[PDB]
């Protein structure tokens, strides 16, 4: 299991530099497969991520969602866990989140994510 290792925050643009790596993808839910085993998320710059679930969905995902999982050889995320951001007070600014994510990567010495 991955919940005990570092999990890099990324957007669609990175998916291919993270093949086989445990990650943390945050984006807005756009479409969920019928067999609720494959939904997709649009990151903060609009690029799209394809989240695959080893198992079918109980409740209804929707809105901003954070997924943790491992990047596939086909540049997708086999999702191990996901949480839905709380927005009842304020709408989560996804484009800002995105600028942070790029900032994290431009300065890994200030936001470590290895070992």
């Amino acid at each position: 299991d991955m919940m005990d290792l570092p999990r890099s925050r990324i957007n669609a643009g990175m998916l291919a530099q993270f093949i086989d790596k445990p990650v943390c993808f945050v984006g807005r839910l756009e479409k969920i497969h019928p067999t609720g085993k494959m939904f997709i998320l649009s990151d903060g710059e609009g690029k799209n991520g394809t989240i695959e679930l080893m198992e079918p969905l109980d409740e209804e995902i929707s809105g901003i969602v954070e997924v943790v999982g491992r990047v596939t050889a086909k540049a997708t995320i086999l999702c191990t866990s996901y949480v839905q951001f709380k927005e009842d007070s304020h709408p989560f600014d996804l484009g800002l989140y995105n600028e942070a994510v790029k900032i994290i990567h431009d300065f890994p010495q200030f936001y470590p994510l290895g070992i």
Binding site: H90, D93, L96, E99, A100, I103, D106, F107
Partner: protein
């Protein structure tokens, strides 16, 4: 626009060292609140706030409007420690600010000062380690003093941006 600063900067740059005061803005977290002097005996007069003298004679003397009264007036004068990721700053906060940082009014506060020595310390315990945006005047003093002109609840989306630009700016070098 706003004069955004960091504690280290206000110190470092020497704001308030000279002639007239200096005004700056920073985001900070309150790290400590002194519960002692936080409250004083206030002239009961309209808009007057001088400290009334306790004439043990059941009466209260405001030296400013040279009058005496029975009634009382409570007024906050909260000494606080605000700190950021690099520094801290002892700032004094009158009625206005302090009521924001604490949650209640000088009336409601001072009273509970007698009643429960605890339910009181409760408000002070709670209010600590919270963040706000502070507008802060700064000028020298002899026997540098800091006065909290305003207090707003931090806006994160906007501090996020500000921070972002700051990082990018730090990069250009």
């Amino acid at each position: 626009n706003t004069n955004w600063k960091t504690l280290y900067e206000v110190k470092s740059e020497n704001l308030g060292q000279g002639d007239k005061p200096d005004y700056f803005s920073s985001v900070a977290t309150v790290v400590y609140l002194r519960k002692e002097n936080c409250m004083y005996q206030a002239c009961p007069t309209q808009d007057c706030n001088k400290k009334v003298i306790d004439q043990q004679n059941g009466l209260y003397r405001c030296e400013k409007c040279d009058t005496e009264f029975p009634n009382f007036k409570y007024r906050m004068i909260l000494s606080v420690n605000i700190a950021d990721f690099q520094e801290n700053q002892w700032v004094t906060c009158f009625q206005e600010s302090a009521e924001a940082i604490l949650g209640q009014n000088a009336a409601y506060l001072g009273e509970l000062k007698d009643k429960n020595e605890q339910a009181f310390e409760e408000v002070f315990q709670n209010a600590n380690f919270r963040s706000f945006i502070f507008r802060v005047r700064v000028k020298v003093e002899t026997y540098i003093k800091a006065t909290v002109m305003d207090v707003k609840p931090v806006d994160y989306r906007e501090y996020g941006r500000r921070l972002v630009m700051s990082i990018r700016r730090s990069a250009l070098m």
